[PDB]
Design an enzyme around this catalytic site. Structure first.
Site, PDB file in Angstrom:
ATOM      1  N   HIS B  41       0.826  -1.182   0.000  1.00 26.03           N
ATOM      2  CA  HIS B  41       0.000   0.000   0.000  1.00 26.03           C
ATOM      3  C   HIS B  41       0.847   1.213   0.000  1.00 26.03           C
ATOM      4  O   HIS B  41       0.313   2.318   0.058  1.00 26.03           O
ATOM      5  CB  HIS B  41      -1.090   0.059   1.068  1.00 26.03           C
ATOM      6  CG  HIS B  41      -0.636  -0.011   2.487  1.00 26.03           C
ATOM      7  ND1 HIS B  41      -1.084  -1.011   3.324  1.00 26.03           N
ATOM      8  CD2 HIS B  41       0.119   0.818   3.241  1.00 26.03           C
ATOM      9  CE1 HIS B  41      -0.576  -0.791   4.539  1.00 26.03           C
ATOM     10  NE2 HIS B  41       0.144   0.309   4.515  1.00 26.03           N
ATOM     11  N   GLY B 143       2.501   5.419   9.992  1.00 27.18           N
ATOM     12  CA  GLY B 143       3.882   5.417   9.541  1.00 27.18           C
ATOM     13  C   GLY B 143       4.606   4.158   9.961  1.00 27.18           C
ATOM     14  O   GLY B 143       5.726   3.917   9.527  1.00 27.18           O
ATOM     15  N   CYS B 145       3.656   1.052   9.320  1.00 29.57           N
ATOM     16  CA  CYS B 145       3.476  -0.067   8.442  1.00 29.57           C
ATOM     17  C   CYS B 145       4.791  -0.473   7.969  1.00 29.57           C
ATOM     18  O   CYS B 145       5.687   0.364   7.775  1.00 29.57           O
ATOM     19  CB  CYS B 145       2.575   0.297   7.268  1.00 29.57           C
ATOM     20  SG  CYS B 145       0.873   0.682   7.746  1.00 29.57           S
TER      21      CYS B 145
END
Ligand SMILES: NC(=O)c1cc(N2CC2)c([N+](=O)[O-])cc1[N+](=O)[O-]
Ligand SMILES: NC(=O)c1cc(N2CC2)c([N+](=O)[O-])cc1[N+](=O)[O-]
Ligand SMILES: [Cl-]
Ligand SMILES: [Cl-]
Lengths: 306, 306
Positions: B41, B143, B145
């Site tokens: 993503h 942030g 991820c």
């Protein structure tokens, strides 16, 4: 987003751990620049511990009696000295992995991470707090002496604890990196019992602020209180007295959540009086006191180190 | 000696973390050898997330659109590809700090450590368990991820989790390092709700064995039970059914303590039925289920990594 007991990344400290052996005793040391720090009881035999005279035992030791091994390589010891309860072994090579660091003596209620090690090798990392009675509640087996505790700000490691012993009740005691024990404890096998393990109130409050930020709000209520009224309650529950300095440190969390500190104190007071009735807060069934207000803000904002 | 939730030392993983930015999105990546792994993503804008067509969005990206930074140095991306929900960015330099490692897909009930990171920089480390409903209960802010979960045996890091998202209830979901989500979750903003969060019975038992080894024995009693009788109770309390495979894994702890597994099951059954009546076990007021039997033995024996 969640809230968990979190240790600092430990890699900067892993690169400082070494094994120290003196005669038949092996434990951990901390290699910073060209000095290796370790508990002085490395010079003791198990029977020496009931009433050791370290200064006399050390007379029988020379630099070559301390064997220091960093991973698989041996360090050459060119000098040794006792500083309070720690020995400093001067080696001929600076540790290449030495991070920026400082030594600090922490105050009770402050938290830090521990890198448990055996024979110079890390095994795990967890978060601790210096308890009001100056013990810490850790996880240490024999051979773990010399493991350290620390905090990290950016790129600087502040070392604050070195592990030395276990009390008969199962809690732990140790020294700052200057070799001074936290609390009244001594490095010998004697009757040493810990005092009251009081709860660190300002941390419980910070953790209630973290809970509200994370969605656990069931404990919030319609009441308020005062510092003197709250403190009557804290005394009854063996909680640390809360001071205006503590209220001030919670100011940033109070501002971010819109909940005045005294209103949170009123929530904690009901929690002490009525219990949690079978409910949980941030996954716990009791009131957590090993997160400082700085810890909650750090973790609720994602601060990092490099 | 004590027993604490302990994470693995994280330094070997800290040396693999990098920042990845694609367009306006920045998150974490894992650099192993010459590949950087990160959530796919990273190519999405926030409005893309409601119903992203990743394959179409990726057509608009070239190698130079992925900016990868390791600490202060930039890596050159010579190839990129999607594998399930992760992107693999091939870089022109092998990571010098790459540890021996493996990728593994863990089973529910297994534990691992997480190195939470923001912008490629570690912030902390904590222990997690893959829950029976395949979510994990972590601490992640936006942030984070791309932060990973792992286990270490000796000198080999087995990577088992990469963080991708937060569910509306506050728990977390992610993928193995091959990009397959644990559980039914998908990387888009949709209604995804977690199933029952059942308790991992075999870990609770292991933790009761750790408690007895550490001196907390008040919960031991005069009873025994059977697997089928115990399991009736476990169903009522939303506990995982206990199998003979679980009894067998607790065999080493059963042997070390002299407490037969079924007798410990009888202790747990009373604990479920009557509660803890205000007492604590290993410092907890509830039954802990995020320690595996392997974890208890490891920690009760001081295993280390190098
Ligand atoms: N658990 C103990 O009885 C004990 C063990 C040790 N270690 C050396 C064996 C030390 N100490 O290190 O001084 C002190 C104590 N003490 O209670 O005072
Ligand atoms: N908390 C959410 O509503 C959420 C947020 C995100 N992140 C992208 C914004 C993702 N997801 O990553 O797909 C999925 C969900 N979801 O519930 O399915
Ligand atoms: Cl914990
Ligand atoms: Cl608890």
């Amino acid at each position: 987003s969640g809230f968990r007991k979190m240790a600092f990344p430990s890699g900067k400290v892993e690169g400082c751990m070494v094994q120290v052996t003196c005669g038949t005793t092996t434990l951990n040391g901390l290699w910073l620049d060209d000095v290796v720090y370790c508990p002085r009881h490395v010079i003791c035999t198990s029977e020496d511990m009931l009433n050791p005279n370290y200064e006399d035992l050390l007379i029988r030791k020379s630099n070559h009696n301390f064997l220091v091994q960093a991973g698989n390589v041996q360090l050459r010891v060119i000098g040794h000295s006792m500083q309070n309860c720690v020995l400093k072994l001067k080696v001929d090579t600076a540790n290449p992995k030495t991070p920026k660091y400082k030594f600090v003596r922490i105050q009770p209620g402050q938290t830090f991470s521990v890198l448990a090690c055996y024979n110079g090798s890390p095994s795990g990392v967890y978060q601790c707090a210096m308890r009001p009675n100056f013990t810490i509640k850790g996880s240490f087996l024999n051979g773990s002496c010399g493991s350290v505790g620390f905090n990290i700000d950016y790129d600087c490691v502040s070392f604050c604890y070195m592990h030395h012993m276990e009390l008969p009740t199962g809690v732990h005691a140790g020294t700052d990196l200057e070799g001074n024990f936290y609390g009244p404890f001594v490095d010998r096998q004697t009757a040493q019992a810990a005092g009251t393990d009081t709860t660190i109130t300002v941390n419980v409050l910070a953790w209630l602020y973290a809970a509200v930020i994370n969605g656990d709000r069931w404990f919030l209520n319609r009441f308020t209180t005062t510092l003197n009224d709250f403190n009557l309650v804290a005394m009854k529950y063996n909680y640390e007295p809360l001071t205006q300095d503590h209220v001030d440190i919670l100011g940033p969390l109070s501002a971010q959540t819109g909940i005045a500190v005294l209103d949170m104190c009123a929530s904690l007071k009901e929690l002490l009086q009525n219990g949690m009735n079978g409910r949980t807060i941030l996954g716990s069934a009791l009131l957590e006191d090993e997160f400082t207000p700085f810890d909650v803000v750090r973790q609720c904002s994602g601060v990092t180190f490099q």
